[PDB]
Each structure stands twice: as C-alpha cells, then as structure tokens.
Design an enzyme around this catalytic site. Structure first.
Site, PDB file in Angstrom:
ATOM      1  N   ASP A 217       0.834  -1.192   0.000  1.00  0.00           N
ATOM      2  CA  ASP A 217       0.000   0.000   0.000  1.00  0.00           C
ATOM      3  C   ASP A 217       0.873   1.248   0.000  1.00  0.00           C
ATOM      4  O   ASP A 217       1.899   1.305   0.683  1.00  0.00           O
ATOM      5  CB  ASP A 217      -0.926  -0.002   1.216  1.00  0.00           C
ATOM      6  CG  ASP A 217      -1.856   1.195   1.244  1.00  0.00           C
ATOM      7  OD1 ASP A 217      -2.769   1.263   0.394  1.00  0.00           O
ATOM      8  OD2 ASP A 217      -1.676   2.069   2.118  1.00  0.00           O
TER       9      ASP A 217
ATOM     10  N   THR B 136      -4.497   6.845  -2.379  1.00  0.00           N
ATOM     11  CA  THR B 136      -3.241   7.417  -1.909  1.00  0.00           C
ATOM     12  C   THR B 136      -2.147   7.297  -2.963  1.00  0.00           C
ATOM     13  O   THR B 136      -1.628   8.302  -3.451  1.00  0.00           O
ATOM     14  CB  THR B 136      -2.764   6.736  -0.611  1.00  0.00           C
ATOM     15  OG1 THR B 136      -3.025   5.330  -0.682  1.00  0.00           O
ATOM     16  CG2 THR B 136      -3.485   7.322   0.593  1.00  0.00           C
ATOM     17  N   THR B 137      -1.800   6.063  -3.312  1.00  0.00           N
ATOM     18  CA  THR B 137      -0.748   5.808  -4.291  1.00  0.00           C
ATOM     19  C   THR B 137      -1.015   6.546  -5.598  1.00  0.00           C
ATOM     20  O   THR B 137      -0.133   7.215  -6.135  1.00  0.00           O
ATOM     21  CB  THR B 137      -0.601   4.303  -4.582  1.00  0.00           C
ATOM     22  OG1 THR B 137      -0.465   3.585  -3.350  1.00  0.00           O
ATOM     23  CG2 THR B 137       0.621   4.046  -5.451  1.00  0.00           C
TER      24      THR B 137
ATOM     25  N   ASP C  89      -8.544  -0.385   4.228  1.00  0.00           N
ATOM     26  CA  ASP C  89      -8.797   0.145   2.897  1.00  0.00           C
ATOM     27  C   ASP C  89      -9.987  -0.518   2.218  1.00  0.00           C
ATOM     28  O   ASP C  89     -10.427  -0.036   1.169  1.00  0.00           O
ATOM     29  CB  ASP C  89      -7.553  -0.010   2.019  1.00  0.00           C
ATOM     30  CG  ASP C  89      -6.398   0.859   2.483  1.00  0.00           C
ATOM     31  OD1 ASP C  89      -6.550   1.553   3.511  1.00  0.00           O
ATOM     32  OD2 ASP C  89      -5.341   0.850   1.819  1.00  0.00           O
TER      33      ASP C  89
HETATM   34  N1  LIG Z   1      -8.529  -5.722 -12.397  1.00  0.00           N
HETATM   35  C1  LIG Z   1      -8.034  -4.491 -12.666  1.00  0.00           C
HETATM   36  N2  LIG Z   1      -7.882  -4.065 -13.938  1.00  0.00           N
HETATM   37  C2  LIG Z   1      -7.393  -2.845 -14.230  1.00  0.00           C
HETATM   38  N3  LIG Z   1      -7.018  -1.962 -13.288  1.00  0.00           N
HETATM   39  C3  LIG Z   1      -7.117  -2.257 -11.970  1.00  0.00           C
HETATM   40  C4  LIG Z   1      -7.641  -3.569 -11.579  1.00  0.00           C
HETATM   41  N4  LIG Z   1      -7.630  -3.599 -10.235  1.00  0.00           N
HETATM   42  C5  LIG Z   1      -7.139  -2.412  -9.797  1.00  0.00           C
HETATM   43  N5  LIG Z   1      -6.835  -1.610 -10.837  1.00  0.00           N
HETATM   44  C6  LIG Z   1      -6.275  -0.239 -10.746  1.00  0.00           C
HETATM   45  O1  LIG Z   1      -5.232  -0.180  -9.769  1.00  0.00           O
HETATM   46  C7  LIG Z   1      -5.281   1.067  -9.071  1.00  0.00           C
HETATM   47  C8  LIG Z   1      -4.893   0.879  -7.608  1.00  0.00           C
HETATM   48  O2  LIG Z   1      -4.944   2.124  -6.921  1.00  0.00           O
HETATM   49  P1  LIG Z   1      -4.552   2.190  -5.363  1.00  0.00           P
HETATM   50  O3  LIG Z   1      -3.047   2.208  -5.255  1.00  0.00           O
HETATM   51  O4  LIG Z   1      -5.346   1.131  -4.638  1.00  0.00           O
HETATM   52  O5  LIG Z   1      -5.111   3.628  -4.910  1.00  0.00           O
HETATM   53  P2  LIG Z   1      -5.038   4.075  -3.366  1.00  0.00           P
HETATM   54  O6  LIG Z   1      -3.557   4.189  -3.092  1.00  0.00           O
HETATM   55  O7  LIG Z   1      -5.783   5.389  -3.322  1.00  0.00           O
HETATM   56  O8  LIG Z   1      -5.718   2.947  -2.630  1.00  0.00           O
HETATM   57  C9  LIG Z   1      -6.696   1.606  -9.238  1.00  0.00           C
HETATM   58  O9  LIG Z   1      -6.669   2.987  -9.609  1.00  0.00           O
HETATM   59  C10 LIG Z   1      -7.336   0.764 -10.325  1.00  0.00           C
HETATM   60  O10 LIG Z   1      -7.735   1.573 -11.435  1.00  0.00           O
END
Ligand SMILES: Nc1ncnc2c1ncn2[C@@H]1O[C@H](COP(=O)(O)OP(=O)(O)O)[C@@H](O)[C@H]1O
Ligand SMILES: Nc1ncnc2c1ncn2[C@@H]1O[C@H](COP(=O)(O)OP(=O)(O)O)[C@@H](O)[C@H]1O
Ligand SMILES: [Mg+2]
Lengths: 49, 526, 537, 98
Positions: free
Chosen positions: B59, B92-93, B390
């Site tokens: 994360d 966040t990321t 999360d």
């Molecule tokens: N099965 C999938 N196919 C395509 N994109 C995905 C899939 N699962 C997750 N993602 C992408 O990965 C990203 C993960 O973001 P994340 O780091 O969790 O944000 P945060 O840090 O705010 O939690 C999301 O923006 C999402 O669009």
C-alpha cells in the site's frame, strides 16, 4: 488607601469623569482616567514609537 | 578571537531555477518509489523501522510513512498520501504518481520562460473541468443490493494482498460497515475506527477468519468459580471501581478508643457490600468495569453467580456498549433498567493459544462488531488489517455517495479527451499548459501496463483511439491479462469520492510546489 | 591613548555602509514575494519543520538575525500586522530603499539631519496628497468595493483564484459580525472569526459556517452528537469531585460519620449537575474539566457535554448566542439558582465528519448570527498558508468598512507621489530638495519590483507608467489618469478604477509613516560600539 | 509656581507603548495603568468613583495558622455556604458605598 473593610466609606473614594480601557491597535491596551475633582500635582506622558 | 560581523548566521539561501526545478526532482523521486505498487500485478515492499519491526506491504500510504526524507519538498508529498489515507481508503498511491507527473509536465513550461502563476491558473481551470467530467460518466448505485456492493469492494482489494481470498474479504468488509451504521438522532454516521475493531491473533488459517456479531477482548474471568458459559447474559457496564480507595480530600481519623479501629475496617467491608447490593437489584449476569475489583467485591458476585471481568479498556467499553445496547454507568447506586445490556447472545471464555479471550457474540442487533483475524504470523496479519481498513472505507464512501467511476484507466482517459476537446476554444497562452494536464492523467494507464509487462506504445495508441468516439468511452486497461477490455464486463469500478479526492489533491500539490522559489534552512525556533 | 573598551568600536562610513547592506539583506529576500506574481518561500527549521509562506510577517519572525540594523526592519514587519494587517512586504522594501538612497546622499558630504528633515517634508506631503486625491468612498461602489479589495490581498497568496469564491467568504464573514458600540462605533472584530484548518478536499470545498465552529470533541461516546433547538449553557468551573481547599481538612473522631463525608463529595457535585440540566440546557461547554463520574448524568438525560474548551472560544459563543459566562453560584445568597433565564440558544449543534477528527458546529446561534470559516487544503503546509492568507484578507475588509476610503493599488499610488514630490522640492527647495527627490525615487521601487517578478520590461513599463501620471498633474483638463497601475498579466498600464484593483488608504498611509520613521533611526548609527558577550566572564 | 524652588520628576510617569508614531503622544493628566481589566465585559464607566482597596477579597484566613475541622455530614455544607456569605458581605459593602 483602604486597608480594612470597616473603614471603606464614601470619603475615601475618588472621582472620574471617564474611566475607560482604551482598546489600542498596537501592543494591547491600557487604562485612561479623564478628569478628576481637585487634581494633584501629577501627570502622565504616553510615549509612542 | 574577534568574531566576523555577519547576518543570519548558519543558514542557507537558494533561489532561481535551482529551487523551481529542484522541487520537481524531489517529487519525481517519490513517484519512482511507489511506481511498482499501483496495479493488480504489484509486489510487496519490505521495510525496516527503527523500533525493530518489519513492515512488508504494497500500500502506498504505509510505505511512505516509514521513509524519513531530508528534502522539504519531499516532506510535502508524504503528507499528501496521509491526507488521502484519512479521507478515503484506497486513494493514496494514485495521487503520488499523478502529482509527480503533473509536476513533470510543469517543469517543461518553466524552461519556456513561463511564470509559475500562469501554469497554476491553467491548472485551476483544468481542475474545475475534471470534476465536472467525472459526474457525467458516473453511474448510480443501488446500495440495498448485496451483490452490487461486493463488486465494488472487490475492485479495491484486487490490488492488495487479500485478492487471493476475495470471496471471504468482501463479505467481512461489507458486513462490518453495515453493522456499525449507527443513527441515533437525525444524522447518519459510520465509525469504522472506534467501533470496528480489528483484532488479530497469530495462529490458525486465514480462511477461518470471520467477522463476529459482537465484540471480543483478551481478558479472563476474575475468579475461577464464576461461569465461563452464559447463554443469555444481562451485561451491566461499569466505569468506577468496586474497591475502597482514598478520597479526594485530606481525610485523617483520630483513633482514641479500642472499638474505633475495628469499626473502620468493618465499614470498608460494608461499603463494598452496599454497592454490590445495588448492582444485583436488576439481577445481572456479567459485570464489566474499567477499574479494579477487590476480593470482597468478588465474594458477593460469587454467591450471586455473577461473572466479573476486571480491567477492560475504555475504548473496548464504548464498543461493547453499542453491541449489547448497554449504558456505561459510573455509579452503582444509580443503576436503572435501561442501563442493562439485554439482547446479548452466547458469552463464552474461549482459549486461543494458551491465552483466554472473552467472546461476546451472537447479538440480536449490534451496532459494533469485531473482525477476528487469524493468520500465520504477526507480519501478514498486519497486512490484512491494513487492507481491510482500505476495504471498509471504500464501502463507507458508497453509503455516503452512491456513484461509481470506471476505473482501471478508463477514468483517466475519459477526461483526457474531454480536456483536449475543451482546449480548442482557449486561444491564449494558457492553452499549452492546459493540454499538459490531459497528458499527465495518462500516467495511470501507463503504470498498469508497465507492471504486467505489456507494451506501452501499441496499447496507448489503441486506447486513445477508443475515446475518440463518444459511444463506449469506458474502455480501460485490464491489469490481469494485459489487453483492452471494457470495464462493463470486468467489473472494475471505483467510487466517486476516491476519484474526486485523487484529482483534487494531485492538482493542489502542484499548486503548492510551483509557487516555491526560495528555501531558507538553518534557523531555530522556540 | 585609545579607548580601553573591551569590545569592538567602528566609526565613520563603515557602519553607514553596513546598515544599508543589513537592510538590503532583508529586502532582497522578500522582493520575490510582492504582487500577484509573487512566489512563496520555504522556512525549514533545524528540527525539520517546514513553513511555506510568502507574507512578510511570518518570514521575518521565524528567521534569526544578528545585526542591530536588521532587527529594526524585522520589528517593522511585526507592527504592520497589528496596526494594519497587511503591508508586511511593502513596508520593508520601502524602508530599505529609503536607506539606500540616503546612503548616496551622505556619501556626497550632505549632512544626515537634512535628510531626516527632508524626509519629513516628503512624508507629511505624501499623506496630504493621498487624502486629497482619493477616488471614492464605499457608497457609490457598494458591495463591489469589498470584493475588489479582497481579491487584491489574495493575489499574492495561494488563494488567488480568478473567481469570487474566497472573496465572498471574507466579505460575508466581516459583514456578519457587525458589532455596534457606544457613540456610534460600528466595529468589526475580526478576531471573533474562528479560522479552522483541516486536510480534506480541495480549496473550493471550504465551508462558511454561519455561526461558530468549535474545535473540540464530545468525550464520552454515549451522548447525542446532534441536538436540534439546543440551549447552550456556557460555564467555566471544573465539574469534578468536590475537593476541599488547603485550609480545610477532614478530621473525624467517630467511624460512623465516615461514609457520610465520602458520599458528600459526590452529592454536592451531582447537586449542581441536576439544577443546570433540568432547566432545559442541552449543550454544556466547560473550560475546566468534566471527570468520568459527571459524564453519566448527560448520557442518561440525553445532553451534550463539551469539556476543556478554550477561554477565548467560550466568550465568542456566549456573546453570539446570548449566553451568560457563569463561574459559580450567585444572586443574593441563593443556594443554587443558576439564573435559568440567561441560557443561550442555538438552531442545531451537530458534530460533523472533518476527515478523521471531531468538530462541533453551531448554526446561526439565534442571537447575533456570527460566522466561522473552515479551511480545506491538501496538506498541513497549505492549511497554514491558507490561514495566514485568510487573516490578511479579513484585515482589508475591516479597514475599508471602518474607514470608507480606498486607493488604487498596483503602483498607482507610488507613481503619482513620484512626480508630485519632484515638483514639491522645486519650489521650497534650498538645501533639502535632494532628500525630497530621493524620497520619490525610493517610492518607485514598488512598481519596479512588480516588473522583475513578472519577467516583464522593467525600465520601459514603469517609464510608461509615470507618463500617464505626469499628464494628470501638469495638464488639468480632467484626464483622470491618477488611477493608472500595472497589468502584470499583459505587461501594459491599466486603469485600476474599472479593473477593480483597490487597496485601503491606511495600507499606504501607515506604510509611508512607518518606513520614514524607521529610516531615521538607522540613519543615526554614524558611531557603533559592540561589546564582547559576557557569558564565560 | 511662585511658591517653591523645587520640582520632583518622579511625579511625572512615562508610559512606553509600541505602536504608531511620535505624533501620537498624549499628555493625559489622569492615571494610565498597564494592567488588564478582569472582567473586561464593560471596560467603560462615566461618572466613575475609584477606590483603592488593599484588602484581599477571598476566603477568610489569618496571619496565624488556621484550619477547618470537619467531623459531620452537614459540616461540609457550613464551609462552602458560609464562605459565599462572607464575600457577599464584602461586595455589598463595596456596592453600597457607590
Ligand atoms: N482488475 C483491474 N484491472 C485494471 N485496473 C485495476 C484492476 N484492479 C485495480 N486496478 C487499478 O489499480 C489502481 C490501484 O490504486 P490504489 O493504489 O489502490 O489507490 P489508493 O492508493 O488510493 O488505494 C486503481 O486505480 C485501479 O484503477
Ligand atoms: N491585480 C493586481 N494588479 C497589480 N498589482 C497588484 C494586484 N494585486 C496586488 N497587487 C500589488 O501587490 C502588492 C502586494 O503587497 P503585499 O505583499 O500584500 O503587502 P503586505 O506585505 O503589506 O501585505 C500590493 O502592493 C499591490 O499593489
Ligand atoms: Mg497582500
């Protein structure tokens, strides 16, 4: 100067036409007594800067 | 030794292009740290803390909290991910990579003799149009549907390490928010930090972890004669002690006669019997307090068949007051029938690994629950605890704002074509930095293919051509396979509050770091 | 032979050049943060605390200086916040350029007392010229004067947006705290506006809470967090266990009277909590302390009890809601009366979600209709900058509404004074005309700094600026060119009357009075003696 | 004047306050104090009668060591309520003066 509460009479009081706290815009605020019956031989100079 | 007459001793001065282009390289450095922790093909990053522990996570918030930087512009990017972690759950990321890319295209215009106030005024016009575009491509959600809410939380845990147990982590995180959805007066509130306690116990398997319908504490019974298995208890919560302590005064007794010293030691016993007689008028079964219980108080509760727990925490007493429906009283002689927590189910003092745990479960309608996590060790149980945090906050955003944005690259490219068509009516010097905002949003589908190993040239050309027509417009990047699949078939949907907070924080980070042209370091404070 | 002082002595023109370089060491720092094209700085402490700001008061306060002539300009920026409330950047640049041009005069064997006497003839005439050439008061413009004066102050900061979002939240905040006083004094106390910071959404989600926003928590999690039609009971005494004083002690001679004294410490405590609660009070604010025993009586009765609030926050709530700040029992030898007719009122007291904290809001307070601003930023560094920029914007609307007089900003005042003082030194100038002429060149550094920070033409735009102000003084054919300023977005002289670049009068009157008075004190350091530090003896 | 050949400069107090310019100096013939007003809810009174009090308006205590003996249930009520009635007799003695 009234020390004991039994001698706190109206003769030991003063008089002032205006006794207000002048809220200044600078370093805080002060008091300013304007006018008194039978004023003594004292004065106060307020110096700014 | 005559000292040198100087001014502003032991400080530094730096201005010009070394600070404007210096804050960009400090922001690009943090964007390269968490670049391999965005897509579903991400990898864990093992960290070491000075306390002696080990943080193995992927994360983006938990990585940057363990990094101590010395650059002042690098300290600003860490507080951005802390803001995204406290507002939403899985937002966040994505902000740190996007703020690093919006500053990457901002460094190009600073070399073109453009003032930083012109690029920021073009960033604020682009920020107001990204919010209006996400509200047009959104979709209303039926919050009463159970299977619809499982697909939203599955889209947030596919990135994290609990994607293997997707059938279990979705049902735990959904049922945890729906139990703590409390509403006393005319205001709906969801408290998943004070009432949704995540207790982890090392041992067992992860498949046996489930959300309990009630609370649990790591406390044993006070006396072995007390019962460890009550079917339907009447739980009475206390706050004060059941002992005899020194009062808040200067009390001192002058003992002159012989019968006076034995009377004081009997009045200390009779005072405990007075408060123990006041709590048994309502006929309870479980007495729970926050302070100590003397042995004389245990004697009256033993013959009355009362199970007493001694030193439960203050945060655990507020959580059991919502689960059992009790009221925490601080006076034994002021107890009422409404202060007794009826409706609690089976109470059992189980033992998990040579340690007793008081289980208060099977409640009728609890307003607070406890997720019981069991795993291999404390290392991976802290990962599931951070992933369920999360996973419960992304369910809170749907219950407060039921709108979904097509994620997985479909959200970033739908606005990148909206900003490109809207930039044709600018006709000014702010047109060119307005175009760079749409090119900076493309780094989120760029990172989904760099993590799975797909091509970055052959895929971006086909994805940009899909958003030219206004028909579908929801085509994103499939992070699992590596091709272009529509997001109406995969089921990858992100909430609106996650996508709005991502764009609002990435632009305003670029607003703050572009107005910095001077840095003074070396002064002390009080 | 020489002086036997154990320190250091430097006379002549050495200190006369050191004081100018000490004043230019401060002015060259804050020269990059003036005007709408100004840029913020970074203030990094030794422990690592980062303070991103651009106001001239926060920069010079945290920065440590050593020279005695540098401490005069640093304390000059501190006085601008108290007297005016913004100007702490423009006063420091003028007062340092006043010493720079006076250094060129004293090196020409001109006596510095003629420069001091020459500056007073130029400072008193500049205030006399700006009070006879003001544009309009606040009757013709109406509410457009308050919005245009607010946007001029925010242009040098992080809240300088093109819209009127932050401008309307400042004007509606000062207009909602109009407190009339005796002898016809409609005062506007800007300290009563509680400015709160929260790292949440963007800057366009900054709430304007009509009422008060208390920065505290409820405490016990059994109280209702929303009370509609509330009666606020403002009191300042710790609701704790009744402890005797130093002169009172409990000396008992009979063990039968032991438990009656131990129960009396809580029965006297619960006696006050039942007579302040049965009168209809729902919200209780306390600056002292409410212990765990007293929290039971509010959960049972369904009342909100807030503990350990600030003494400055209790006075702003009790004045705006009509409550009486009570400390103890009173009213002519009564046991417990509490004067229940003096309770406050509120429409709704609701604790909202402020991104993982607790914030108590009071809606409109039913007596005075106060206001509080909750700022929203991306991190803690933006929220500290947004608080300082909002406080400088509240001080602009305060001085305009009190003193209904505005002057055009953007170098329009300094351009008219640069040509008027040259003609003023021509008539009555015999030996002091060189000091009045350098007072006009020192005032020209305010439009000169705007040309450098905007990367525009420097010696051509300001030369075109004074071309319009010269024709407005030598050709009286109603040219109305006294409001000509700078358009830094285009690089051309604009008319600030139609463009809406307005500044208060006393942001330029008190700036020229403080910069002239500070330049006199640093001009009299012809001899300087610095003693050794007496630490190790 | 015309009665003495001496003048004490200790009868002329000088109050130093930061703010404004030297033209803001004043020659107020009354008393200027730098202390604050508690409570500051009024801060203005016309036709005021000023009294200097050297007595301490607080709980009764002597120069000798004084203690309160509490050995009864109702004796705690006679401590707090009699201290409120003591200072009420001091304030009403001040208020009836005028
Ligand atoms: N099965 C999938 N196919 C395509 N994109 C995905 C899939 N699962 C997750 N993602 C992408 O990965 C990203 C993960 O973001 P994340 O780091 O969790 O944000 P945060 O840090 O705010 O939690 C999301 O923006 C999402 O669009
Ligand atoms: N729209 C504008 N056009 C031209 N000049 C402006 C504009 N807005 C602000 N300014 C100028 O920027 C300057 C900012 O001064 P500032 O640093 O706020 O002074 P202080 O430090 O005393 O608050 C003002 O003197 C004003 O003339
Ligand atoms: Mg300003």
């Amino acid at each position: 100067p009234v020390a004991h509460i039994d001698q706190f009479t109206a003769d030991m009081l003063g008089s002032a036409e205006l006794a207000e706290e002048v809220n200044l815009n600078g370093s805080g605020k002060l008091l300013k007594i304007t006018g008194c019956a039978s004023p003594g031989k004292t004065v106060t100079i307020v110096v700014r800067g | 030794h005559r000292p040198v007459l100087v001014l502003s001793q032991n400080t530094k001065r730096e201005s010009g292009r070394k600070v404007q282009s210096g804050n960009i390289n400090a922001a690009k450095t943090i964007a390269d740290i968490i670049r391999t922790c965005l897509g579903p093909k991400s990898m864990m990053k093992m960290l070491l803390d000075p306390m002696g522990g080990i943080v193995m996570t992927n994360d983006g918030n938990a990585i940057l909290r363990e990094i101590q930087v010395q650059h002042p512009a690098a300290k600003s990017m860490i507080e951005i991910s802390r803001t995204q972690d406290e507002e939403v759950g899985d937002g966040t990321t994505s902000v740190i990579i996007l703020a690093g890319e919006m500053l990457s295209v901002a460094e190009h215009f600073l070399e073109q003799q453009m003032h930083p106030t012109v690029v920021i005024s073009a960033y604020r016009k682009a920020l107001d149009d990204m919010i209006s575009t996400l509200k047009k491509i959104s979709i209303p959600v039926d919050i009463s549907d159970s299977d619809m809410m499982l697909n939203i939380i599955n889209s947030s845990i596919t990135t994290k390490a609990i994607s293997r147990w997707s059938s279990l982590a979705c049902n735990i995180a959904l049922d945890a928010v729906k139990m703590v959805q409390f509403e006393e007066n005319g205001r709906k509130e969801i408290d998943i930090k004070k009432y949704a306690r995540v207790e982890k116990i090392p041992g067992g398997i992860i498949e046996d972890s489930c959300v309990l319908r009630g609370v649990m504490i790591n406390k044993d019974v006070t006396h072995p004669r007390m019962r460890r298995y009550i079917k339907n208890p009447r739980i009475v919560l206390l706050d004060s002690s059941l002992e005899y302590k020194k009062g808040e005064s200067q009390t001192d007794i002058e003992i002159t006669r012989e019968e006076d010293f034995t009377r004081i030691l009997q009045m200390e016993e009779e005072y405990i019997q007075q408060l123990c007689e006041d709590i048994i008028q309502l006929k309870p079964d479980v007495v729970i307090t926050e302070k100590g219980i003397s042995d004389l108080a245990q004697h009256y509760l033993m013959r009355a068949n009362i199970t007493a727990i001694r030193r439960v925490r203050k945060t655990d007493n507020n959580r059991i007051a919502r689960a059992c429906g009790a009221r925490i009283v601080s006076r034994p002689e002021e107890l009422r029938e409404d202060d007794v927590g009826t409706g609690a189910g089976l109470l059992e003092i189980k033992k998990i690994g040579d340690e007793y745990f008081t289980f208060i479960t099977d409640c009728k309608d609890p307003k607070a629950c406890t997720i019981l996590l069991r795993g291999a060790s404390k290392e991976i149980l802290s990962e599931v605890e951070r992933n369920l945090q999360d996973a419960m906050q992304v369910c809170r955003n749907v219950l407060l704002d039921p709108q979904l944005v097509p994620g997985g690259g479909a959200s970033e490219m739908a606005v990148a074509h909206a900003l490109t068509e809207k930039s044709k009516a600018m006709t000014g010097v702010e047109q060119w930095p307005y175009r760079a905002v749409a090119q900076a949003l493309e780094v989120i589908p760029r990172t989904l293919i760099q993590n799975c190993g797909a091509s970055t040239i052959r895929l971006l050309t086909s994805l940009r051509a899909k958003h030219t027509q206004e028909n579908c417009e929801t085509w994103g990047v499939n992070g699992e396979t590596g091709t272009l699949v529509d997001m109406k078939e995969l089921g990858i949907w992100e909430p609106l509050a996650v996508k709005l907070q991502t764009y609002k924080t990435a632009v305003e980070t670029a607003v703050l770091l572009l107005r910095i042209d001077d840095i003074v370091s070396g002064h002390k404070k009080k | 032979g020489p002086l036997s002082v154990f320190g250091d002595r430097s006379t002549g023109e050495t200190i006369r050049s050191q004081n100018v370089m000490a004043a230019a060491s401060i002015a060259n720092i804050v020269k990059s943060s003036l005007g709408p094209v100004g840029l913020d700085k970074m203030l990094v402490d030794d422990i690592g605390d980062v303070t991103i700001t651009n106001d001239g008061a926060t920069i010079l306060k945290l920065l440590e200086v050593e020279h005695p002539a540098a401490k005069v300009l640093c304390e000059l920026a501190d006085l601008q916040d108290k007297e005016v409330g913004d100007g702490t950047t423009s006063v420091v640049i003028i007062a340092a350029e006043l010493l720079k041009n006076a250094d060129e005069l004293v090196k020409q064997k001109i006596h510095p007392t003629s420069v001091i006497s020459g500056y007073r003839l130029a400072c008193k005439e500049a205030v006399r010229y700006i009070n006879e050439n003001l544009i309009v008061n606040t009757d013709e413009l109406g509410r457009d004067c308050l919005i245009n004066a607010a946007k001029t102050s925010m242009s040098s900061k992080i809240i300088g947006i093109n819209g009127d979002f932050f401008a309307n939240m400042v004007v509606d905040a000062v207009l909602a705290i109009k407190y009339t006083d005796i002898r016809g004094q409609p005062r506007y106390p800007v300290n009563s506006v509680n400015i709160l910071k929260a790292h949440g959404r963007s800057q366009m989600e900054s709430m304007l809470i009509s009422g008060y926003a208390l920065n505290c928590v409820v405490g016990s999690q059994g109280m209702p967090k929303r009370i509609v039609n509330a009666k606020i009971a403002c009191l300042d005494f710790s609701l704790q266990k009744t402890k005797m004083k130093l002169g009172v002690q409990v000396v008992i001679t009979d063990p039968e009277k032991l438990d009656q004294i131990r129960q009396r410490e809580s029965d006297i405590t619960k006696e006050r909590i039942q007579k302040i609660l049965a009168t209809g009070a729902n919200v209780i604010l306390t600056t002292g302390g409410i212990d765990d025993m007293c929290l039971k009586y509010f959960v049972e009765a369904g009342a909100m009890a807030v503990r350990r609030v600030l003494k400055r926050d209790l006075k702003r709530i009790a004045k705006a809601s009509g409550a009486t700040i009570l400390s103890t029992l009173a009213n002519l030898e009564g046991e417990e009366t509490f004067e229940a007719a003096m309770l406050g009122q509120a429409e709704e007291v609701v604790q909202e979600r402020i991104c993982d904290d607790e914030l108590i809001l009071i809606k409109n307070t039913k007596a005075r209709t106060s206001a509080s601003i909750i700022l929203r930023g991306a991190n803690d560094f933006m929220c500290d900058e947004m608080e300082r920029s909002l406080h400088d914007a509240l001080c602009v609307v305060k001085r305009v509404l009190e003193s209904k007089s505005v002057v055009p900003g953007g170098g329009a005042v300094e351009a008219a004074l640069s040509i008027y003082l040259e003609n003023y030194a021509t008539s009555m100038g015999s030996r002091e005309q060189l000091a009045i002429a350098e007072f006009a060149r020192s005032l020209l550094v305010i439009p000169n700094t705007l040309a450098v920070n905007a990367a525009q033409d420097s010696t051509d735009l300001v030369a075109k600026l004074r071309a319009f102000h010269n024709e407005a003084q030598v050709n009286p054919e109603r040219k109305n060119l006294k409001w000509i300023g700078l358009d830094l977005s285009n690089g051309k002289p604009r008319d600030n009357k139609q463009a809406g670049v307005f500044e208060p009068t006393i942001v330029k009157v008190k700036s020229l009075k403080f910069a002239t008075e500070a330049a006199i004190t640093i001009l009299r350091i012809d001899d300087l003696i610095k003693l050794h530090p007496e630490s190790k003896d | 004047p015309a009665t003495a050949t001496s003048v004490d400069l200790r009868d002329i107090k000088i109050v130093k306050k930061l703010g404004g310019t030297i033209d803001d100096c004043e020659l107020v013939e009354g008393l200027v104090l730098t202390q604050k007003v508690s409570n500051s809810g009024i801060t203005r009174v016309e036709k005021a009668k000023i009294g200097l009090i050297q007595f301490c308006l607080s709980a009764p205590k002597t120069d000798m060591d004084n203690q309160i003996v509490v050995s009864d249930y109702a004796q705690m009520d006679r401590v707090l309520r009699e201290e409120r009635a003591y200072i009420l007799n001091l304030v009403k003695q001040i208020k009836k003066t005028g």
